[PDB]
Amino acid sequence: GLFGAIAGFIEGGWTGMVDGWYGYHHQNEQGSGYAADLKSTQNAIDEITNKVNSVIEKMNTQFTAVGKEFNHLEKRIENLNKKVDDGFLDIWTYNAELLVLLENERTLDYHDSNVKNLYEKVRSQLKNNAKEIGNGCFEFYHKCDNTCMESVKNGTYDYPKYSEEAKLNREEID
């Protein structure tokens, strides 16, 4: 992974999360569950579909009857014609394959970048009020219920409102 997220510090994916590409998994006193980040997942879809359409729609082809007919005394022009068809073959075949290899690599890097960005977005909000226990998880230093947890997902986490409680739990474990 170019960004070291997918198959990186987050070892595996979630079969449990079936409503999106990227998302969260919360766990508190009110239970646990899977959730998908709709906004980031949507943008990802739009941009990938625009990437597929670009590879497909940019191919505008002339009307052409490839076939040609030459008699027993037109062997040279027949081979010239053959060389032209073979030329386009080798040119298009090579370009197609590599276009697929290279773009495939970028697509996987793309998703990877998205997961990393999402991780840094949560970490940036939690700041000190939480701990990074690895595997792409955050352990809160305070009591984060369902309302609190939901505010992290939508980027409206109130750090100051948990700071005091966090510090006490923090310094004890520190």
Partner: protein
């Protein structure tokens, strides 16, 4: 209390190749390689092709008895022969500039067969009935091309022949004719009386003087003699003149036509259907959504580029890791 960040995983078994690693199972993907056709020869741009059945272009355009000359469409996007279509020039000879003709007839928007030199009124001083042969047999009898006339001497004489046609059709007129070459001097006299003859065809653009070349050549379809076939496109307003003292296989039917730039000639057993396509292949049509195809390099119309790829699967989702 914990909050984890993660990605999607499913039951997908799709695999793609990257420049760095081969066969990477992914959650979602699409194919860029069109690898399926419909096994049909279809209309191209809404216009059906011209299927010549058991005949080839030579047999069809000359009027070979085994070929349909009556109900041929007035237009077609391309021509289709079958690998075994043998009925062509039933009388052995050389069909000059044949491939060019085939090419120039590959597509047409208007096609009218008409009697250029009507049999009943065109040749009062020549025999327009005895011109038949076992080489081109019809309904259990000697016969000949339906679009040509093999003029022979009337009585014991073959007077100087001279006839012209002015193209008053709103378009080009395709005109074919033949030059018969006996195998003996006796056959030359038995056919045209005169021993030293000539033929002359010429328009504003075309011109050529033919001379009978008599010799015994290997037998083909039971014929030792030869019959050479020629043609040219007479443009609207122009005239074409025929002059001969023998050996002239005269034009009877000609074709008014407006050519549609380009197109080709598919040779396949693949059946024709009432389907509509924009890219035709010798073994079936294909949908021109995807940019690459690996069905067949020889195609007609707006087609995806041909490749030797067997799979061009493009990842859209992420690597799949359910564990």
């Amino acid at each position: 209390d914990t909050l984890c960040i993660g990605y999607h995983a499913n039951n997908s078994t799709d695999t793609v190749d990257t420049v760095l690693e081969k066969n990477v199972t992914v959650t979602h993907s699409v194919n860029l390689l069109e690898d399926k056709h419909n096994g049909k020869l279809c209309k191209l741009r809404g216009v059906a092709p011209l299927h010549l059945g058991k005949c080839n272009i030579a047999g069809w355009i000359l009027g070979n008895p085994e070929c349909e000359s009556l109900s041929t469409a007035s237009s077609w996007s391309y021509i289709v022969e079958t690998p075994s279509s043998d009925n062509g020039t039933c009388y052995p000879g050389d069909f000059i500039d044949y491939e060019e003709l085939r090419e120039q007839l590959s597509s047409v928007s208007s096609f009218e067969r008409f009697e250029i030199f009507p049999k009943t009124s065109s040749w009062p001083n020549h025999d327009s009935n005895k011109g038949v042969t076992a080489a081109c047999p019809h309904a259990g009898a000697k016969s000949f091309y339906k679009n040509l006339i093999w003029l022979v001497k009337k009585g014991n004489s073959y007077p100087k022949l001279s006839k012209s046609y002015i193209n008053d059709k709103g378009k080009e007129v395709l005109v074919l004719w033949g030059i018969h070459h006996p195998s003996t001097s006796a056959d030359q006299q038995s056919l045209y009386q005169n021993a030293d003859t000539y033929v002359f065809v010429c328009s504003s653009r075309y011109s050529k003087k033919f001379k009978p070349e008599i010799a015994i050549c290997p037998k083909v379809r039971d014929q030792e003699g030869r019959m050479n076939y020629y043609w040219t496109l007479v443009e609207p307003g122009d005239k074409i003149t025929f002059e001969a003292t023998g050996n002239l296989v005269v034009p009877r039917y000609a074709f008014a036509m407006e050519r549609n730039a380009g197109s080709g000639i598919i040779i396949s057993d693949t059946p024709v259907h009432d389907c509509n396509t924009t890219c035709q292949t010798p073994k079936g049509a294909i949908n021109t959504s995807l940019p690459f195809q690996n069905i067949h390099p020889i195609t007609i119309g707006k087609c995806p580029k041909y490749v030797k790829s067997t799979k061009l699967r493009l990842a859209t989702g992420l690597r799949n890791i359910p564990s």
